[PDB]
Amino acid sequence: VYSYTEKKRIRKDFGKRPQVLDVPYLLSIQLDSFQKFIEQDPEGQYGLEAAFRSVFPIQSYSGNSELQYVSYRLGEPVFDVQECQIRGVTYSAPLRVKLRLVIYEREAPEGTVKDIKEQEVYMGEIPLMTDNGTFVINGTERVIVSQLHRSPGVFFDSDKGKTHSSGKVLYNARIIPYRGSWLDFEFDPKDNLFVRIDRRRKLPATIILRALNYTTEQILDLFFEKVIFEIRDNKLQMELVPERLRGETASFDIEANGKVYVEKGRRITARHIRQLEKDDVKLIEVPVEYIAGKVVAKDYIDESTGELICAANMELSLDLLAKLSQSGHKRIETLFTNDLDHGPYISETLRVDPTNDRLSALVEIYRMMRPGEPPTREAAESLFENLFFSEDRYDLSAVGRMKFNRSLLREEIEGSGILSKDDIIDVMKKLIDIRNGKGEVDDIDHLGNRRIRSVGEMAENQFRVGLVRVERAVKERLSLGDLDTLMPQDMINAKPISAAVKEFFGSSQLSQFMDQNNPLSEITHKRRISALGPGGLTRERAGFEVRDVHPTHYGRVCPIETPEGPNIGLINSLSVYAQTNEYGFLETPYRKVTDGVVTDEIHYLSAIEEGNYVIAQANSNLDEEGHFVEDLVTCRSKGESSLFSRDQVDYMDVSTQQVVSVGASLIPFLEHDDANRALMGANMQRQAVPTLRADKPLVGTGMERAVAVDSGVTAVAKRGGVVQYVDASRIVIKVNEDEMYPGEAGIDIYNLTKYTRSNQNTCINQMPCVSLGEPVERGDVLADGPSTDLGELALGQNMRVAFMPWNGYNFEDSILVSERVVQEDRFTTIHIQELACVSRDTKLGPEEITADIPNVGEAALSKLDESGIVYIGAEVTGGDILVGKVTPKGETQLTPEEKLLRAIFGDVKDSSLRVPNGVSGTVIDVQVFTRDGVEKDKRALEIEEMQLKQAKKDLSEELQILEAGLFSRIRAVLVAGGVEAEKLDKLPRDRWLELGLTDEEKQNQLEQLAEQYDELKHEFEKKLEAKRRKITQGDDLAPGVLKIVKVYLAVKRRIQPGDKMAGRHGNKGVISKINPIEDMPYDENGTPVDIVLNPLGVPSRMNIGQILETHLGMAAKGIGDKINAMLKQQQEVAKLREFIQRAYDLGADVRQKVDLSTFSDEEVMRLAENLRKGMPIATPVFDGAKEAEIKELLKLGDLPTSGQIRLYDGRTGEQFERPVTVGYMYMLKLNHLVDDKMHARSTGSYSLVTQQPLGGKAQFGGQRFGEMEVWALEAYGAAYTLQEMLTVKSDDVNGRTKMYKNIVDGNHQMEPGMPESFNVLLKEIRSLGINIELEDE
Amino acid sequence: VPLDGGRFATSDLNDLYRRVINRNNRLKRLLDLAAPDIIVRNEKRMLQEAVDALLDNGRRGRAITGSNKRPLKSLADMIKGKQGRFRQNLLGKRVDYSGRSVITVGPYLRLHQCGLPKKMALELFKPFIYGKLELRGLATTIKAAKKMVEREEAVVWDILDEVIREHPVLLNRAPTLHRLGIQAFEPVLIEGKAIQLHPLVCAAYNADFDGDQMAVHVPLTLEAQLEARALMMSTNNILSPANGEPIIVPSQDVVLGLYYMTRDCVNAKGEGMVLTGPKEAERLYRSGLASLHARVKVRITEYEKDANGELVAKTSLKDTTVGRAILWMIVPKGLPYSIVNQALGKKAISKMLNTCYRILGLKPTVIFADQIMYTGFAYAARSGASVGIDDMVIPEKKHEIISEAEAEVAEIQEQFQSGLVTAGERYNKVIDIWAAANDRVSKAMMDNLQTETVINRDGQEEKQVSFNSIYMMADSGARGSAAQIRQLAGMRGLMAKPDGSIIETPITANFREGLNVLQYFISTHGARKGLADTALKTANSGYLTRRLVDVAQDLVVTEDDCGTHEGIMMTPVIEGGDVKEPLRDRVLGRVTAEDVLKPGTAD
RNA sequence: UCCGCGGCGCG
DNA sequence: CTCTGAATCTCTTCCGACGCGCCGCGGGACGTAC
DNA sequence: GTACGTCCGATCTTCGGAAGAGATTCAGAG
Ligand SMILES: [Mg+2]
């Protein structure tokens, strides 16, 4: 059930719960995002075609002309990835599109156009996709990060208590379109509905409503109900409706049909409600005093007078009632105006409204959005039509439309990209309802309220911006069209679109220079979710809630992986099994559960769907038929952990690993340590550094193989076979017969990437990890890379760890280290630095690049050749001269008479490059790029010839193997049809053409194949010429430079005290003092430990799993050295087979179930000798082995059950009273070395703006005193001390020179002088119109 | 300044000046030909916004930018903010003759001396070395001295040893908050590329050894060196200026060693005899014939200064353990013996050393601390105590307590399902019963872990204090807490939701046993909240500290006695229950306003 | 490059 | 009715740690001669 | 394709938190 290479070294695995689904492809987000933007999808959606149809149809101002679009196409890259990164040129592809220009005829706009012209037109240049999903721009790989932002739609916010200081909380409506102006509605402390456009001044709500040509009566009809009063035999009465009487105290005795139903002056009751609903009381007469507190709704006019008796929104009085009664108006309609249900907020706002006309409202909004301009009705209409109904300026995405429909409880989740009148109406109704208290606002912290962006999204946005600008220019030109007297190339400029795409790829907020030093570093850097960037919140403005983890975050975004610092909770990473939605949301898989059986079907659940359902936890035990043996099982309804019945759930968790991200998933025994220590440990593993020789980690998690295969650093086979030839730099594979295609058989060639520079000045190197002649299967490892070992990723090393206080050298976090570990240099790491050397084109002649320099020593030029460049492989010291360079200066001013005077008494100036001091090493490679048109030195000629023979070797070997295959097939064909088994091979293969054959297909195919042989030689030679021309040609560079020289210096950084060591639990530490091999504590056997930790950290920090990994290390090492001792004596393989079978069968029920009866004895012994360095163990995240399993592993070996072992002292050699816990633990080295931050300076350069020392390491500088340091020093009584701090060593140039002369004279005296920074401030304030002075002494 | 090539790097001031002079030339040539009034008014206005923008960009109306979208710099931009000349170049500045490296311990040093690398010593004292070698006449000019120090022969390391002999230097840490954050020592040369420091000073610095950076500077003139040697020595800085608490408290390791020292079992090897002097005690300890913590009748002869400063020697026989006598060897004359006849808690030893300083003096105090620390590490290394997996004695009653609590909450849920209680009331009572069960299981686990050790005592059997390693590491007070060990062994209890409410479901497991997804997931809330608070609080703390310090820079003592007769009546604080602060601790070390009389009125 | 901006990381 | 008029409501500005360590970009466009 | 003369527009938006200035106003005495 396992492949060939897996059987070479199989890792023992724990775990009881069976898996149901494999780990998906990790690097999937970027690939899925970008395999939508360049692909030419049918009918157009989420791609280039959408923006095309959005912007490409353009017409002039009735000039009978229109530009449109047909199709686009992308070309092949000019260079491959390797050449692009070597030279520093972008790895991009051409963008080719065909467009159509038409010109309509006069007196017939609808008629057929006058003429059409068609051409292919080119503009823009976008980069391609690496298989590793990175972008190379200037020879440096870059990675774009997905951005998290608020989902477009409607919103509701509350603002509890902060405003108005009275508890009267307001409510507001936020409208966030995908591309358009925002729209805001808000309340007031006086409960006034108001609006704000683009965060401008505050304006009433009904202004827009009447701007939509709506009468006030229609608005009142929409937003209010009717109360009807009818004139009858004695004045006024009202039609009674039961629901209009809830929670009200009667103003009079409510009696109808001559019977009392509700008594006078008393509150309505539910019994009285039942009486009202049962007695069918349609009408009742009410005294007018109860009516005298109401407001009329509509406008009533007397038709005889033609006048307005009472206006709308007017409170009614008895005189008005008498007037309308005597006018003959028997129908009276009013508003309900409930105290709790329907408050007259709209009526009050209409009362406050100063404008009551569509024209007046338009003028008001027009003058508010732009003061100081004359108003016009047509101008106001043109402005308003471009506010929320113009597709060009306002656009809401389809997902925003779906969210809008969902929030308003609509039925169609689809609609237009613009809003509508009914949208505003029912939004206002929703705000009213929320104001009434019915319904709830929508939180912003919920996951369904945010959307994740992708590289295609921002690429399309920047592309759209560039295209709208260039189409504005194109339309401007098209308004001045001609009679086909111009070319379809001239009006279009590729410069703006190219500039827009390169600024986005280069220096965007999300286009950061990516970090890469470890495979896990890239796999966790690419899978990053950021809340920053454009459209995101700033670092300072972030509160606690945005950084806080939501209950809905489970299974989608990892809460256990985030960087620590000023930005916590915003750079979170997604979960492992999380995937994206079609709309652009997050989903997590689940297992379908029937009534009693958990079906292995996998469903995908949205971010909202889990609320209506209930999910069972992964660790829930069950039978073999899907039936839970317990009936009360812990589950969650809406993030409430609780226990429900046996049959109430719909889905259950796929596995226990769908909670944390990949970074935290590599930490074994995570459940036994604190979360914070897990965070710092994940950060430390994120900052790992590769070493020269790696060793496998004893404790595995299971996904190390997945991590290795998901990383593109390893040349994984695309086709299986048997390796034909093996070399340290090149690997060639013989393709299997089934996998090879019929035509052009071929065999693949894998070229390893040798020593090259990384982004952290480390080395990226790949080495072979396979033997010769073995079979290989598809999708398998062939050559390991950095920190990779035989298909798995090995970061640190296994050290014999011990936990005890030793003489205080482990005071709090310090650690003592033997020299035994550095005797093999297993922790030594390599470092490489790139040095820049430019031959610029300057005035007064270009600079020259040879070593012919005066005032230098003979040994200085001895290392450099006649070309002035040091030989490859020469050791260099710090501060020495790298290459020779001289720069002309000119300014001769030759004096014909005074020339002899210049020789009686009393040019090109050297600018030789020097290595920075303090760093030494041996030169490895020097690369020079020469722009065309300049003569190349001989050194560049042999460099080009190096590349030439490399290309010739590769081309010749592939041509030779193709020729071998072609001649083999020619011989095979010639065997039949003119049989010559022995006559064919008597003669050399150079003559296989003119053999005498009769008229069949064989002979004619022989001439055809000879012609094909010649033809293949021809195109092979053409390819060789093209490649050699590309190599030998000059390269484009910056303006005003002739050539540039790159220097690669390698240094081997050894270990030394002051370095930062750490484990896999956040247990930090710095090595304090190396101690001799003899003085460590040692046991009876005689093998002493090499590293000693501080046991006192365990009680403080809530991490205790280190003891568990220690005991697992003891068990693994016991198995390993038992195997090594067994194999050391020449022994027969059956005993080893039995012992390994016993070891692998040890434990409870697991999914391994492996046996050695299906393995060849050679493979068995190969695995056995491969396992002599320890027994690798795999554990799950939360289903890991418990203490009892450790007990059986211990009793399998000879180690004590408790694990603790008595030790002999190393200082003086005596037994300690107590046993001590010892073992093996996988310790990690990180990149922060000791001699890269340490620096000092006595005297150096000074700044020009002020005579003060510089800083940093690129410039020889020193540290800076702060104002807080000034406070600290002035707290003490040292008065002189600060005076010389601020006087002697800082400012006074005369003073510092004089004291330097005093010091070299042996006297240490202080003389103040005057600071010049004060003079600088004096000059600054003197530049202003304010006079500064200094008074009398 | 000309950048790479023939290009030049310009400032915004140059562009602003050229713009305003161009506009001025426009004004000058404009009035030459009598331009129309509208045009001259508009051009004069443009000049006005030009000069205003030169003064301040975007202070009125819209700002203007250069090629980059960043706004142009202003004249006031060299004053306002951090980028202003004040806080960037006037109040603080970069200083020559400085060094920065990574710290380590090297505990074999004294409190007044610290290590320093060879190369850093060579680099920092270059002019002093030049002057000394010229005085000794090994060179003629500076160039010869430069060549010789570039060769670093053996003839210069001795000179460097000479110049360092009595020269003191100062050490600084970046995030200092108190005046003790900077101290001055006599450096001692040591090989390597790191700096070794005494274990006491980092505790005052609140600096661990996780890779923190350290700053060092050198006093130049004689006055600077002697004023450095005068005030900010470790000996002269032992008590915090804020409160009378000494800063010389031992933190973690030596206190653990001393706590392990003064813990005597009921019976061990070499028990029940008599012994004369602590020399014989350490002789027996090194011989291995007796336990280091075996109780033995011995005699001592201590000194007491009960007279007028006169120390009187008294001798007698006492009952104690061997280790207490061993530590009595290191005690100076004046201490009474009863101070070291107990468990020697961290607070106890802190009070002991405080009394030693307040009675005997300063030099005995600092030397006593030094050799106490030395012996503490020695006997800690001799001990070699370690943590173990079995150190967490799991109580057997945990499962039955959990079952009882589950039955009780099931009963509460059944009562709720009957429509007899509200959700809030049942929520509160479930919280109460969970808290009660947590307290009961906490008492059970501490009772199990406190005294489970059983020994035959050369009799029938007995029970004594527990020798669980975690119990010594907790009870000593070095690190940990009762809550920490409670979480380590027993269930960790209840925690609150991010909204401020508390979830009803308890975490019924400890870290030793496994944890489900839900408990870790919910505890993530509290962990994230704590880390967010710790990260966010620093900026506010810095801002408030700067605001406080910037106002009181002027108040300095100038006179001896103002001679006023106005004082305050101040009383010990009582909120209503127990007294919070006694008056004695509040009025200590102050001058009485008036002649306070005893309540013997007219006395 | 002599400085500004941005990014990441460390305490 | 009127005139303050103090009281409240609304609009505008400045301020948000402290050292660093490393890396990457840096006036530029854009027309006018030539 | 390179040196030089010459100047620089429709446009985003989401922070407490307070301090302070100014605008407005509706409340009451004359
Ligand atoms: Mg630190």
Author numbering:
A (entry chain C): 2 to 907, 912 to 1342
B (entry chain D): 253 to 855
Could you share sentences copied from the article?
RNA polymerase (RNAP) frequently pauses during the transcription of DNA to RNA to regulate gene expression. Transcription factors NusA and NusG modulate pausing, have opposing roles, but can bind RNAP simultaneously. Here we report cryo-EM reconstructions of Escherichia coli RNAP bound to NusG, or NusA, or both. The clamp and shelf module of RNAP (collectively called the swivel module) rotates relative to the RNAP core module producing interchangeable conformational states that have been termed non-swivelled and swivelled.
We reconstituted an RNAP EC bound to NusG (NusG-EC) on a nucleic acid scaffold that directs the formation of a canonical post-translocated state and does not induce pausing. The initial reconstruction of the NusG-EC resembled a non-swivelled conformation, but to further investigate the dynamics we performed heterogeneous refinement in cryoSPARC22. Three classes contain strong density for NusG, and we observe differences in mobile RNAP domains compared to previous reconstructions highlighting the flexibility of these surface-exposed modules (lineage-specific insertions SI1, SI2 and SI3). The three classes differ in the extent of swivelling (up to 4.4° rotation), and represent the conformational states of the NusG-EC. The binding of NGN to RNAP was previously suggested to be incompatible with swivelling, due to steric clashes. However, our reconstructions show that the swivel module can rotate 4.4° in presence of NusG because the tip of the β-protrusion is flexible and accommodates NusG during swivelling. NusG does not appear to alter the intrinsic capability of RNAP to swivel, but several additional contacts with the β-lobe, β-protrusion and β-clamp may disfavour more extensive swivelling (bottom right). Thus, the binding of NusG does not substantially restrict the swivel movement of RNAP.
